[PDB]
């Protein structure tokens, strides 16, 4: 039976009874940095159980007219346990991820969600002379939401959250070139993505740069008949893999 999985990382375990396959990045599994690719000369820290475990964010509610949500991935885990504590004391860090999006509904519901993972998702602003602010690019483990309409310009340097351009100026149907899965409520219950470390440098500062972005977009809207449960949540659970840190100094933020 291909329908069951079990993922164990640290002191946490994920159990799934109805799933698709597991998507592994670009075919690469996350591993540690080698000696011929390293730059910094001091010894890196490897906590290996206090950081590499499953953290669960807040839950969002899927509605009949909902548009989509997104997260910035080395920013939602910035107050999460000892993963966020090692980010504040160190200057460099590299990390791969295991993302588990989960959403259950009955055989009487329908809908379809696309779960992509976009690297270097640089977004646009509503005022064309400015760039968006940090508070509207990312929340602290809280989803920022796409809109079904076009956002106008103001003094808040907002993101153009028209969902069909995906905040980047592209076609939203062409988002399947990134590592992705679907959650079809007819057949699927969860989605699992394992991402390696993707950058143009072997290590990078984990506060001034978000090199991954998790988008969840309902291509087919949620629908049910009267009598079925109206409240359907979506829960995201992310686990760091092979996280190491370098450049220990006093605590930022």
């Amino acid at each position: 039976s291909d329908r069951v999985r079990s993922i164990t990382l640290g002191n946490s375990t994920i159990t799934t009874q109805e799933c698709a396959n597991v998507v592994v990045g670009y075919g690469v599994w996350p591993e540690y940095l080698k000696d011929n690719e390293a730059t910094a000369e001091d010894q890196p820290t490897q906590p290996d159980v206090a950081t590499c475990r499953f953290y669960t964010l807040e839950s969002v509610q899927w509605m009949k007219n909902s548009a989509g949500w997104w997260w910035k991935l080395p920013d939602a885990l910035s107050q999460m346990g000892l993963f966020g504590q090692n980010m504040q004391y160190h200057y460099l860090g590299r990390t791969g991820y295991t993302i588990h999006v989960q959403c259950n509904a009955s055989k009487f519901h329908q809908g379809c969600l696309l779960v992509v993972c976009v690297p270097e998702a640089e977004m646009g602003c509503s005022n064309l002379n400015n760039t968006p602010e940090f508070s509207e690019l990312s929340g602290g483990d809280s989803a920022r939401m796409f809109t079904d309409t076009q956002v106008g310009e103001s003094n808040a340097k907002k993101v153009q959250t028209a969902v069909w351009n995906a905040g980047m100026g592209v076609g939203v149907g062409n988002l399947t070139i990134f590592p992705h899965q679907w959650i079809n409520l007819r057949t699927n219950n969860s989605a699992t993505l394992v991402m390696p470390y993707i950058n143009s440098v072997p290590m990078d500062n984990m506060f001034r740069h978000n090199n991954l972005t998790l988008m969840i977009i309902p291509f087919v809207p949620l629908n049910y008949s009267e009598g079925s449960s109206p409240y359907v949540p979506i829960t995201v659970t992310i686990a760091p893999m092979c996280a190491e840190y370098n450049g220990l100094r006093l605590a930022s933020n």
Partner: antibody
Amino acid sequence: QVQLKQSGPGLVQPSQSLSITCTVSGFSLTNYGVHWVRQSPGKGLEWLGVIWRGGSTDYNAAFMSRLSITKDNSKSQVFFKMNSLQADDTAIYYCAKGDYYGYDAMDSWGQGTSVTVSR
Amino acid sequence: DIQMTQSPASLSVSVGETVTITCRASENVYRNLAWYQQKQGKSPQLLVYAATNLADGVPSRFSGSGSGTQYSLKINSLQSEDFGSYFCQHFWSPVFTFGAGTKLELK
């Protein structure tokens, strides 16, 4: 969850500054912004300003100079100030939160504080 | 700036009647529109946002229709809980401008 409420001076003299404080609960000010709307008997509803979730403001063009809104995220309280208080300012003032699923509409309103500017 | 014209000013209907209230803008707001309901001497309540979407606790008798510069609300079957003032507001760009108002009678 539960939502916000406000507190006010009630009634003051003409050409005196006004200070009404909205204290929020159930949500954080780093995720949502606060709008200031004025329900007038002769002029209906009118929008005075907004303090955005990042900390930047936006004011009405008729009331730009006299109006100033600040906030402090740790105390979960919003403070705005309006000056010179003419006779047409007799109305009911509301504080209401926006960013209703990202759609910039007012979600939940305060209880309102009716003011009177006469001697 | 941009002004929202609300029509009509007042209506007189009965329980079980269909009510249509419209709003018109000076220029295109790209369906950045909200609707509010105000009862006797209280705070307004958000009812319909984004020119089609319904609010949290709002029942399915209300309906939002419109695009461009022409928008409309429809109430299918009236109840005793629905009379009062109805406003339309755009949140496209500052300055945000409310509608003039429309009151219901239920004679």
